[PDB]
């Protein structure tokens, strides 16, 4: 299963599997955020 | 198992800051308090 993440400075979609050293291509930053979910979320305008 | 109905559906459900292992079928409180 392709697990995707976003770098902190390049902001490119990187696919890494379990037990991998947290890194990103074409750079060396080590802050990796998770993309937003695709599930529907309901909000109230109140 | 539940002491009343004999079911094995014992779930740990904390009700308002009270840890409590209770049967899920008849609601019999098996254990409470930690």
């Amino acid at each position: 299963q392709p697990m995707i993440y976003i770098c902190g400075e390049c902001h490119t979609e990187n696919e890494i599997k379990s037990r991998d050293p947290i890194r990103c291509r074409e750079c060396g930053y080590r802050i990796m955020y998770k993309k937003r979910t695709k599930r529907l979320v309901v909000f109230d305008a109140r | 198992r539940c002491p009343d109905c004999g079911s094995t559906e014992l779930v740990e459900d904390s009700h308002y800051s009270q840890s409590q292992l209770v049967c899920s079928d008849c609601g019999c409180v098996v254990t409470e308090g930690v």
Binding site: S18, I22, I31, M32, K34, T37, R46 | S19, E32
Partner: protein, 1105 residues
Amino acid sequence: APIPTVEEKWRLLPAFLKVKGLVKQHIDSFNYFINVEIKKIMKANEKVTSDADPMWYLKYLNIYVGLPDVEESFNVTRPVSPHECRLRDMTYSAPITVDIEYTRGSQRIIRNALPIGRMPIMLRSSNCVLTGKTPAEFAKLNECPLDPGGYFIVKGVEKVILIQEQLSKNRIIVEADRKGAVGASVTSSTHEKKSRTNMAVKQGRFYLRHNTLSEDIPIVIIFKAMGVESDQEIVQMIGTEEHVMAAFGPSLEECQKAQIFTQMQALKYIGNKVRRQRMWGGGPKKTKIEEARELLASTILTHVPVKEFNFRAKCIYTAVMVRRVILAQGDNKVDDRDYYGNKRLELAGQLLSLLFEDLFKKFNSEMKKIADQVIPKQRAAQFDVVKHMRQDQITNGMVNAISTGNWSLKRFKMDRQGVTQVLSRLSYISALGMMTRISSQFEKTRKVSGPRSLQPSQWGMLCPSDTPEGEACGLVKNLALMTHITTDMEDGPIVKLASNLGVEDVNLLCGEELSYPNVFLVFLNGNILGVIRDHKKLVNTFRLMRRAGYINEFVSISTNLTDRCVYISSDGGRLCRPYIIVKKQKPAVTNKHMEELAQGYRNFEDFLHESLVEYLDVNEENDCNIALYEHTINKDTTHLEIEPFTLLGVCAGLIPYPHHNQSPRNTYQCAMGKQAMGTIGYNQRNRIDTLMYLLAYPQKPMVKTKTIELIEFEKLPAGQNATVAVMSYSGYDIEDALVLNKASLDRGFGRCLVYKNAKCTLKRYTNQTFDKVMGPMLDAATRKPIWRHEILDADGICSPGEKVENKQVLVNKSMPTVTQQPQYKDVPITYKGATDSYIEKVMISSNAEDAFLIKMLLRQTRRPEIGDKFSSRHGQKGVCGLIVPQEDMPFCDSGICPDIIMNPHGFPSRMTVGKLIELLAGKAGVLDGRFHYGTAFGGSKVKDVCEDLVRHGYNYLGKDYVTSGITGEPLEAYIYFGPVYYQKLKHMVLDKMHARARGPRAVLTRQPTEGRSRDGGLRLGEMERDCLIGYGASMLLLERLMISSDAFEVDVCGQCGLLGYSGWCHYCKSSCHVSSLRIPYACKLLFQELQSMNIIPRLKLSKYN
């Protein structure tokens, strides 16, 4: 003919803020520490060698701190931003390296770059990456340009070293004792030893007391021991006044009672009163007289130096001290400790210097021990320090001292606590005010009520109104807007100029000249510099030379005519304030100089060099005459106040028209503004803290002080302007409460955001096993994840964008139980919360230890409701009492309905006319599209805003014709409408709401836990028990304190009176006399503890009848 006034004079304040001011103090101190002081410390311990195997040494050449880097990469460094250190929960430090030369096998081996430690780098310092950066480059580094900086980042947390306040060292203090005896004390402190020696008059004669003497000895014996043996010379040194001789007579008589008449006899008598420091190693060989002479020369009065066993200066010093005691024994001229002229402020620089010196000495001692243990017995393989230079010592020491905040220096015997504190990120004002905090040496634990008072010496230096309301009232203070802390000087040219100015040497003349009325003593940092005549010329020449630039501008000179002492202070930590020099009823600063400053021709340094503005110390300003304004300048005026509103601090600067309000109101306003909710910085979105409060639509105030423009608060506001009408409505605003409009809250007014952090760690243990996150446990019945694991993604980590409910897992963490197949038990991170939260972001990082750190930023959007605390920027804290609809709100002719209705009854008891003035100025400003100023001791007058109101067609007093919304009929009295800058506080009813079921209990004592985060219950205190006793409710007290709290049923044996178990007594080996008994569990615990203490309680039970 009024004196001309320089209108642009206040322009001197921002220029001063360009090089100095609020945050530059700690920055400059840290830079001086890492650039100059560290090199001096390294030079002081440049060579270290061991006694065994001579001709071996380790010589330090030069030490460097470098740029901050991270040791994440394998044996490779990498530049790291402070925000990255905040995210990764690591420290922001730079590698302390040093180049050295040593001898391995008697062959000299040199190293040019060998790291030895890691120094935590203060933000915005010289070596910090944030300095010399543009706001765009700050955005590239995810750092706010308006961030004050100056704080350390350790393990992801922001620590600030508070400015320490202490008494000045090497100063005579004349004070009364517990029994009323007026004695003296001097704490002579050198770079090595600090010794407080006292002098008492307990029996009409002066005894000298020191920690190195078994019993206090007469002062005349010490005089005879220090070289001067003639009693006439002693009396001349003490004084020639008749009352002085009459007071000193008993001491001479007591000395003549004994047979002490020579130096040898006095030294022997002193040595008899000397006790060995618990069998000091080494053969004494008749050191009694030698020990006495060494204690007199070195231990006693360390700050007074003896050239070569010549106690002339020390004799003169103790004679002056005795004379001061004699003079104080008459008229009660007792010096006060709260006088800030005798106070010294230690910044982070001096503390870090002492800590680095201690750590380097410990490292050198450890290296010498390793050398002594390794070199003489190991092998022909020559020992080298490089194989034993542990680099974690200094790093761990610095990290622990900065994080924990407790400093234990055995070399100085200093045991301090609370030195570093967590930087408060409630708002920009909170951090900006906490950065300029100052703690007291009193270290509050008791009701002293002697330093807690507001002394007049705090003028211009410390803020009078800004103080934490509570137990820390008066002992935690804030610096003023315009203030500076001095550093240490070389003290050479001062001595040279003093010697060249006619100061006669004290060794050339006897002490009788000290008793002359026209002879004035000149001191220097507690050392007797000499004597002088016509001290006016000396003071004028010294001040003129300081103004010329040949003497440092921070060297202070003061004169005390009561004691006739000229004090010359050059030590660091003294508070100084800039003042405009006034010569012959006309200030040196003119309109042309201010025009040149505005055009950029000159700066504040040019004003300093051209003898226009000079720094004055508290001791120096004690003798100077300062004028508040130009019209106050008279013939006897030496200086002019730059700006009066600089008296207030940073937090006090937010108060509009503070001189129209009461001082407790200003204090409460500062305390609440330290907790005001609002934006933190431009990087508040990428910032992930444990608790953050943000405002949906922050607005800058309409009535803004010049301090607000100086601190750039308008760029980061922490409140909103609402159309407040001062009136009584529905009786839901009785005591400090306020009524909010439902339509206003519905349209975004007061909307707030609460961001919380949830952090989890997946660390590798000693064994080759790691914490792993399992996927969502899908339900086989529906082929979907369960309600608990609903929000989890495919990797077992909750994905941002969804809502989290109570008792739901965010990270499905499972950890092994071994440290053959690994056995994993689940320890998921469940979300404890009354309301739902939304995940904004999930950050996953990896440390050098292969531990994965996962941080989820939960967001909650909250609307003002009943129970939310609101402030009005005037100390008028209030709680929302009722939320009425828009139609129920009263309306004016224009149709404007008020958002906040406040009670008028709060005004008369508190006299907050400043609030009314702010309301009027804000109304005028929103009418004419202007921003009025509420500057302290100034600002826009009432007449101007009244004219602005009458020009726009509104009433000149704010009161407008208003029709009641409920009945539809006009009100009999006009309502005071106007825009007021209300700020919401972090105190919310949702977070403070608590309810306790049976819940959990403590293991030791089976009672509810303490806090709300621990699901604790409310405690019935001793006073509540007293009230229940007074009411006489025995059954209610029994049910509360026994039945509902710690009820238990024990088994007591009626034969021996001891406690049994399960209806059986092990003591008597029987069960016939065992009976059940109800009891509090704490009582059973007490009985068991008493039985452990051999205090056996024997219970004789009986029937209830």
